[PDB]
């Protein structure tokens, strides 16, 4: 292949290429009219055809980053321009992309959306690709190409009914956040840490497959994601399409779960394999200890390849423990490597290695007992009240943080409780990991935008594996000077009784926060006393004949009394 | 491809010894759970001995416990089977297998050898 464009145009096909090219342009030039991107893509497409016709024809030879880089530089940047002088021969384009600056899409009315989708369809779907990508610049291209199929699907069936369009948006926000964490994680920690992550992931999903079949996959999976983060982005679709292709053909040596997935069309099959259920873990496995802890050959075995040995130890743990989080497994592997290094240059190394599971135990039980305490508490209190018990926890821990932010975390976190304590004990830690990683991802991106505590920052850029623990490590802040009393923020009105449940809660939580900030001393029993007295205050005044006089009057009686319980 | 190759097999006096070797070729050849299976004349395959990737775990059929040992070099890429106190019973084609588990099931091994023959009689 001399002509890359034509190597891609041939493999991907025209529809995929155009979408992929549009995504790349959209991801780079975010604030930039749809009609621009459309124009550029049409100029590339037409040029790709002339390279399918003739590899010999000029500039077919030039690299895509040049070719695409060339067209971005076509098109004045008053609205990042300096990279454009020359297509970089990108690292300027990336890190020059904000994760956070465009009006939130406001949906056109459903009859109008339906008319247009019927009237053009091709433009309407293209605009989707266009809008999500500018808003979300680290989304995997292959999944996107599919979300759009799941758009075109909704409209064709719906046009009663599009709550489903709202769900698609919620999934996109997630499959966005995760790709950015993955890309960042590879860039900060290297390709090694990612390869390890992937091992853990796939050996849980496929405990039957051989360590050589996993390893092969991890190399291909790491290639794809290394490209999609580099952003050339046609290769990934090409190379991911070759993974699915491969896995489909080798189901029998991988998973008994892939049958239903590997019948589905090219775009859908790839999504299904990644969501596919873990296989039944095999029978007649020896104990983990016998190769890794019991053997008197560890050091020699570790020495011949350090990396394969570690990779095997991780694969074995993972097949054994689907329940364990991918991050816990990685921490355990790190501990093993650390042990082997101190132990191997030692007299009696086997005696030093032998007591190594004594170290894994604390790491396994930290998250498990953590999950339990919080699932118990969720199960007695329920979503809202649990949210409230979290608002007190975390504002006691980091009071310096801004209230609207506190009330956004704690509500999301309590929503995690209701999405993971639903599941049987088995699946909690994987599910928790999944949801928490987005929330610590967005939280730490914001703290750098507007930093307020040093301790949070340390947790926000220690090892990825360290951070959920580091935040769990955070204790109650005992230097915090109580914020000043302020009457308007502890004053309520008639409106709260009319407002919707959603609105109401946030209002009542926002108060809770500000209460803790003003009285961070008070014990949870004192603070149960107040939220009880508040509950009573709200329901009384909601039944009262003159709401407002009741709110006004009882408000002063309440506050008078509650400050009287400072002491 | 992941090739297996066997050798060491022949004729041997009852009471004597033989050491089979299987050399392994292909990616990640060292990693796999590996097994010896024998096929006595006019019968099916049956597991003689099994060995984990680093030789820290070994199963044996009862037929041969106390007489046979199973070992792997790994660097060499060669799997062994040290046969002692041979009995005419043990006269079977011997076969090498590679898989993902320490199980004694023919179906659960992906890769097989061509098989070396062992005869035991005076």
XYZ file of C-alpha atoms in Angstrom, chain A residues 14-530:
517
model
C -17.095 5.316 1.940
C -19.737 5.759 4.600
C -17.435 4.863 7.473
C -14.589 6.936 6.136
C -16.566 10.071 5.781
C -17.962 9.741 9.263
C -14.554 8.994 10.677
C -12.970 11.933 8.832
C -15.774 14.227 10.003
C -15.241 13.104 13.575
C -11.573 13.870 13.370
C -12.178 17.352 11.979
C -14.933 17.949 14.473
C -12.746 16.820 17.340
C -9.970 19.227 16.273
C -11.997 22.233 15.081
C -14.741 22.271 17.705
C -16.127 25.796 17.307
C -16.534 25.610 13.555
C -19.756 25.458 11.479
C -21.208 22.168 10.291
C -21.047 23.548 6.738
C -17.234 23.888 7.035
C -16.648 20.306 8.139
C -18.958 18.990 5.441
C -16.986 20.900 2.789
C -13.577 19.583 3.954
C -14.786 15.987 4.136
C -16.173 16.177 0.589
C -12.800 17.446 -0.670
C -10.961 14.573 1.034
C -13.473 11.912 -0.055
C -13.266 13.054 -3.687
C -9.454 13.002 -3.379
C -9.500 9.478 -1.886
C -11.432 8.195 -4.909
C -8.686 9.560 -7.197
C -6.216 7.454 -5.151
C -8.391 4.349 -5.355
C -8.355 4.894 -9.151
C -4.602 5.521 -9.244
C -2.054 5.050 -6.377
C 0.359 6.743 -8.846
C -1.732 9.980 -8.941
C -0.048 12.711 -6.843
C -0.162 13.324 -3.073
C -1.788 9.879 -2.708
C 1.683 8.957 -1.253
C 1.586 11.656 1.451
C 0.732 10.620 5.026
C -2.838 11.153 6.300
C -1.658 13.401 9.120
C -0.197 15.552 6.335
C -3.242 15.248 4.082
C -5.724 15.954 6.902
C -3.295 18.403 8.472
C -3.166 20.170 5.079
C -6.992 20.658 4.905
C -7.347 21.879 8.518
C -4.761 24.549 7.696
C -6.896 25.472 4.692
C -9.403 27.731 6.537
C -7.914 31.837 9.440
C -8.201 31.242 13.171
C -9.333 34.383 15.060
C -11.594 31.995 17.014
C -4.204 26.837 18.217
C -3.642 28.668 14.889
C 0.125 28.362 15.166
C 0.107 24.578 14.951
C -1.890 25.078 11.737
C 0.899 26.925 10.040
C 2.092 23.368 9.392
C 0.289 20.096 9.985
C 2.575 18.949 12.783
C 5.054 16.403 11.277
C -0.657 16.926 16.365
C 0.659 17.011 19.958
C -0.071 20.723 19.443
C -3.635 19.937 18.309
C -4.085 17.604 21.320
C -3.639 19.170 24.769
C -4.957 22.105 22.759
C -8.387 20.457 23.084
C -10.547 21.370 26.131
C -12.375 18.613 27.982
C -14.929 21.152 29.249
C -17.641 25.718 25.766
C -20.714 25.421 23.549
C -24.430 25.864 24.250
C -25.861 22.615 25.428
C -27.682 21.101 22.477
C -31.371 22.014 22.727
C -33.402 19.389 20.900
C -35.707 20.617 18.125
C -39.342 19.563 18.764
C -40.023 15.883 17.915
C -42.286 16.484 14.961
C -39.599 18.829 13.517
C -36.774 16.297 14.138
C -38.877 13.593 12.478
C -39.735 15.677 9.438
C -36.102 16.534 8.848
C -34.841 13.012 9.381
C -37.291 11.845 6.783
C -36.596 14.812 4.508
C -32.739 14.541 4.326
C -31.715 11.742 6.737
C -28.107 11.877 5.561
C -27.605 15.449 6.794
C -29.509 14.792 9.997
C -27.312 11.807 10.965
C -24.129 13.690 9.915
C -25.091 16.610 12.165
C -25.280 14.139 15.079
C -21.784 12.885 14.445
C -20.818 16.562 14.162
C -22.407 17.747 17.421
C -21.412 14.928 19.792
C -17.813 15.005 18.540
C -17.246 18.728 18.981
C -18.779 18.519 22.464
C -16.862 15.266 23.195
C -13.358 15.222 21.637
C -11.940 11.951 23.082
C -14.802 9.577 22.113
C -13.796 6.331 20.439
C -14.640 6.671 16.795
C -15.880 3.091 16.352
C -18.493 3.261 19.144
C -19.611 6.637 17.803
C -20.201 5.251 14.381
C -22.589 2.874 16.215
C -24.330 5.364 18.518
C -25.357 7.084 15.309
C -26.800 3.805 14.009
C -28.720 3.636 17.307
C -29.929 7.196 16.607
C -31.082 6.426 13.051
C -32.807 3.399 14.576
C -34.677 5.357 17.222
C -35.993 7.829 14.710
C -37.045 5.212 12.268
C -39.068 3.292 14.873
C -40.401 6.270 16.855
C -41.414 8.327 13.792
C -46.490 8.025 22.000
C -42.720 7.558 22.429
C -37.846 9.523 22.440
C -36.865 8.977 26.129
C -34.389 6.651 24.309
C -32.622 9.623 22.680
C -32.042 10.932 26.263
C -30.587 7.530 27.270
C -28.280 7.542 24.223
C -26.969 10.895 25.434
C -26.328 9.457 28.923
C -24.367 6.470 27.498
C -22.352 8.830 25.258
C -21.354 11.007 28.186
C -20.016 7.858 29.843
C -18.331 6.220 26.858
C -16.822 9.657 26.371
C -15.400 10.054 29.868
C -13.921 6.547 29.835
C -12.054 6.995 26.518
C -10.438 10.195 27.854
C -9.356 8.409 30.999
C -7.988 5.586 28.892
C -6.066 7.899 26.553
C -4.693 9.946 29.423
C -3.813 6.850 31.338
C -1.756 5.489 28.501
C -0.030 8.788 27.969
C 0.942 9.340 31.658
C 1.678 5.700 32.601
C 2.862 4.325 29.299
C 1.846 1.375 27.121
C 3.009 -1.070 29.786
C 0.500 -0.110 32.468
C -2.265 -0.252 29.789
C -1.212 -3.704 28.553
C -1.453 -4.835 32.209
C -4.877 -3.246 32.629
C -6.084 -5.028 29.454
C -4.759 -8.412 30.648
C -6.764 -8.164 33.860
C -9.876 -7.069 31.909
C -9.852 -9.789 29.237
C -8.813 -12.709 31.492
C -11.832 -11.969 33.671
C -13.988 -11.855 30.541
C -12.400 -15.012 29.115
C -10.963 -17.319 31.852
C -11.122 -20.290 29.462
C -8.793 -18.842 26.786
C -5.055 -19.563 26.965
C -2.617 -16.931 28.259
C -1.175 -16.857 24.721
C -4.558 -16.053 23.184
C -5.204 -13.248 25.699
C -1.702 -11.790 25.239
C -2.207 -11.644 21.427
C -5.507 -9.777 21.932
C -3.980 -7.354 24.451
C -1.362 -6.375 21.839
C -4.067 -5.680 19.232
C -6.356 -3.945 21.722
C -3.504 -1.741 22.878
C -2.645 -0.874 19.269
C -6.204 0.304 18.493
C -6.445 2.487 21.610
C -2.936 3.864 21.054
C -4.071 5.008 17.608
C -7.491 6.364 18.670
C -5.614 8.412 21.313
C -2.984 9.532 18.674
C -6.071 10.292 16.688
C -5.177 9.270 13.233
C -8.522 7.370 13.828
C -9.205 5.476 10.543
C -6.742 2.776 11.502
C -8.508 2.081 14.759
C -11.770 1.483 13.022
C -9.886 -0.641 10.577
C -7.888 -2.471 13.270
C -10.761 -2.824 15.737
C -12.779 -4.229 12.800
C -9.964 -6.784 12.431
C -10.195 -7.700 16.137
C -13.924 -8.427 16.017
C -13.248 -10.273 12.691
C -10.542 -12.326 14.449
C -12.453 -13.001 17.696
C -15.551 -14.077 15.733
C -13.449 -16.642 13.882
C -11.786 -17.891 17.120
C -14.767 -17.906 19.506
C -14.243 -21.529 20.435
C -10.828 -20.816 21.944
C -12.042 -17.610 23.644
C -15.627 -17.616 24.954
C -18.884 -19.548 24.606
C -20.626 -16.169 24.961
C -19.705 -14.729 21.592
C -22.175 -16.676 19.447
C -25.064 -14.219 19.539
C -22.691 -11.257 19.130
C -20.708 -12.584 16.181
C -23.833 -12.966 13.999
C -24.688 -9.262 14.284
C -23.640 -6.782 11.504
C -20.123 -5.341 11.447
C -20.844 -2.218 13.490
C -22.997 -3.892 16.178
C -20.775 -6.950 16.658
C -17.828 -4.924 17.914
C -19.955 -3.169 20.564
C -21.485 -6.494 21.711
C -18.122 -8.240 22.221
C -16.986 -5.458 24.566
C -20.219 -5.680 26.631
C -20.324 -9.511 26.404
C -20.734 -11.465 29.667
C -17.826 -13.212 31.408
C -17.581 -16.959 30.636
C -17.941 -19.766 33.173
C -14.571 -19.990 34.872
C -12.823 -23.349 34.262
C -12.488 -26.427 36.449
C -9.191 -28.072 37.386
C -7.069 -25.003 37.988
C -4.258 -25.399 40.504
C -3.917 -22.975 43.397
C -2.485 -19.518 42.538
C 0.310 -20.141 45.067
C 1.809 -23.231 43.416
C 3.390 -21.517 40.421
C 3.788 -17.975 41.902
C 4.267 -18.492 45.775
C 5.070 -22.204 46.523
C 7.645 -22.872 43.727
C 11.320 -22.696 44.549
C 11.786 -21.452 40.971
C 10.022 -18.087 41.142
C 13.116 -15.924 41.029
C 14.577 -17.968 38.178
C 11.205 -18.028 36.368
C 10.666 -14.258 36.975
C 14.124 -13.580 35.715
C 13.822 -15.296 32.344
C 11.058 -12.823 31.411
C 9.972 -10.464 34.156
C 6.979 -9.156 32.128
C 5.436 -12.478 30.983
C 5.690 -13.839 34.502
C 3.881 -10.869 35.924
C 1.384 -11.026 33.066
C 0.699 -14.676 33.766
C 0.259 -13.999 37.508
C -2.272 -11.308 36.696
C -4.081 -13.483 34.160
C -4.427 -16.312 36.620
C -5.724 -14.064 39.386
C -8.187 -12.484 37.026
C -9.747 -15.719 35.725
C -10.054 -16.793 39.364
C -11.535 -13.479 40.534
C -14.019 -11.828 38.140
C -15.523 -10.205 41.285
C -12.302 -8.296 42.041
C -11.928 -4.824 40.407
C -9.333 -4.479 37.596
C -7.610 -1.812 39.783
C -7.401 -4.183 42.814
C -5.821 -6.844 40.629
C -3.231 -4.367 39.360
C -2.376 -3.277 42.903
C -1.931 -6.911 43.911
C 0.354 -7.490 40.898
C 2.370 -4.418 41.821
C 2.742 -5.802 45.325
C 3.953 -9.126 43.923
C 6.528 -7.443 41.744
C 7.678 -5.407 44.678
C 7.979 -8.532 46.781
C 9.856 -10.451 44.186
C 12.404 -7.674 43.871
C 13.143 -7.407 47.591
C 12.902 -11.199 48.010
C 15.031 -12.272 45.013
C 18.231 -10.584 46.243
C 17.808 -12.233 49.631
C 19.052 -15.232 51.585
C 16.170 -17.701 51.851
C 14.127 -15.838 49.155
C 11.382 -18.496 49.239
C 10.878 -17.755 52.918
C 10.408 -14.028 52.049
C 8.007 -14.817 49.117
C 6.142 -17.453 51.091
C 4.363 -14.937 53.258
C 3.161 -12.812 50.306
C -0.556 -13.593 50.453
C -0.382 -12.036 53.943
C -0.051 -8.778 51.983
C -2.779 -9.338 49.365
C -5.373 -9.870 52.143
C -5.517 -6.172 53.336
C -5.770 -4.948 49.729
C -8.688 -7.279 48.927
C -10.699 -6.521 52.102
C -10.275 -2.727 52.094
C -12.634 -2.341 49.039
C -14.936 -5.228 49.975
C -15.757 -4.043 53.508
C -15.961 -0.524 52.099
C -18.552 -1.702 49.545
C -20.514 -3.509 52.283
C -20.673 -0.622 54.799
C -22.041 1.565 52.016
C -24.464 -0.979 50.626
C -25.871 -1.572 54.100
C -26.276 2.182 54.589
C -27.896 2.618 51.141
C -30.324 -0.230 51.870
C -31.614 1.282 55.141
C -31.664 4.952 53.976
C -32.465 4.709 50.252
C -31.255 6.986 47.431
C -32.062 10.487 48.728
C -31.365 9.983 52.460
C -28.141 8.154 51.519
C -27.140 11.080 49.304
C -27.604 13.194 52.450
C -25.393 10.948 54.598
C -22.695 11.362 51.884
C -23.038 15.164 51.742
C -22.143 15.297 55.438
C -19.253 12.824 54.976
C -17.509 14.603 52.122
C -18.120 18.221 53.194
C -16.572 17.291 56.572
C -13.634 15.874 54.598
C -13.105 18.701 52.058
C -15.230 21.709 53.244
C -13.204 24.129 51.096
C -15.021 22.783 48.005
C -17.926 24.698 46.414
C -21.441 23.701 47.527
C -23.024 23.176 44.046
C -20.103 20.787 43.375
C -20.645 18.960 46.665
C -24.330 18.474 45.841
C -23.469 17.153 42.376
C -20.934 14.566 43.532
C -23.020 13.225 46.432
C -26.119 12.793 44.254
C -24.172 10.967 41.528
C -22.490 8.790 44.167
C -25.814 7.859 45.784
C -27.044 7.009 42.258
C -24.090 4.597 42.022
C -25.256 2.991 45.278
C -28.602 2.375 43.566
C -26.938 0.879 40.471
C -24.486 -1.453 42.310
C -26.234 -2.514 45.539
C -29.009 -3.686 43.178
C -26.536 -6.330 41.917
C -25.572 -9.482 43.906
C -22.365 -9.243 46.015
C -20.423 -10.816 43.093
C -20.718 -7.938 40.621
C -20.434 -4.900 42.939
C -16.694 -4.092 42.832
C -16.493 -4.229 38.971
C -19.661 -2.108 38.711
C -18.459 0.336 41.387
C -15.058 0.750 39.660
C -16.892 1.404 36.381
C -19.075 4.265 37.727
C -16.609 5.759 40.252
C -13.839 6.177 37.700
C -15.861 8.670 35.606
C -16.753 10.612 38.764
C -13.169 10.825 40.028
C -12.129 11.643 36.436
C -14.427 14.660 36.105
C -13.849 15.677 39.739
C -10.034 15.784 39.289
C -10.294 17.597 35.911
C -12.380 20.277 37.685
C -10.102 20.524 40.725
C -7.206 21.431 38.421
C -9.386 24.004 36.633
C -10.099 25.535 40.045
C -7.937 23.929 42.774
C -9.028 24.396 46.415
C -7.293 21.553 48.380
C -3.686 20.249 48.135
C -4.705 16.786 49.395
C -7.252 16.375 46.546
C -4.585 17.307 44.025
C -2.210 14.672 45.364
C -4.938 12.084 44.891
C -5.784 13.550 41.507
C -2.398 12.638 40.006
C -1.013 9.703 42.004
C -1.114 6.363 40.163
C -4.600 5.646 38.763
C -4.698 2.545 40.996
C -3.854 4.597 44.157
C -6.540 7.340 43.782
C -9.881 5.782 44.832
C -8.009 4.613 47.949
C -6.353 8.003 48.375
C -9.775 9.718 48.461
C -10.943 7.056 50.824
C -7.882 7.910 52.931
C -9.058 11.544 53.327
C -9.977 12.338 56.947
C -12.174 15.088 58.420
C -10.551 18.538 57.932
C -9.779 19.836 61.445
C -8.244 23.201 60.528
C -11.371 24.442 58.710
C -12.671 27.761 60.028
C -16.522 27.629 60.237
C -18.179 29.752 57.518
C -20.199 32.774 58.679
C -23.898 32.528 59.548
C -26.000 33.878 56.704
C -29.750 34.357 57.048
C -30.893 34.264 53.427
C -29.276 30.831 52.856
C -31.200 29.351 55.826
C -34.489 30.994 54.774
C -37.204 29.060 52.977
C -40.380 29.970 51.180
C -43.788 28.825 49.803
C -42.174 27.865 46.470
C -40.427 24.759 47.821
C -43.782 23.038 48.482
C -44.818 23.568 44.770
C -41.403 22.587 43.226
C -40.670 19.120 41.723
C -39.039 16.378 43.819
C -35.764 16.845 41.931
C -35.660 20.610 42.488
C -36.799 20.281 46.091
C -34.093 17.825 47.032
C -31.244 19.835 45.596
C -32.620 22.844 47.482
C -32.748 20.911 50.761
C -29.330 19.338 50.173
C -27.752 22.710 49.280
C -28.980 23.809 52.691
C -27.600 20.700 54.370
C -24.175 21.430 52.937
C -24.119 25.045 54.097
C -25.201 23.844 57.557
C -22.231 21.517 57.880
C -19.847 24.263 56.717
C -21.196 26.576 59.438
C -21.292 23.829 62.113
C -18.707 21.160 61.105
C -18.320 20.248 64.781
C -21.816 18.834 65.351
C -22.056 15.037 65.670
C -24.270 13.095 63.247
C -26.857 12.697 66.033
C -27.062 16.449 66.553
C -27.358 16.805 62.763
C -30.015 14.081 62.616
C -31.851 16.276 65.178
C -31.799 19.264 62.827
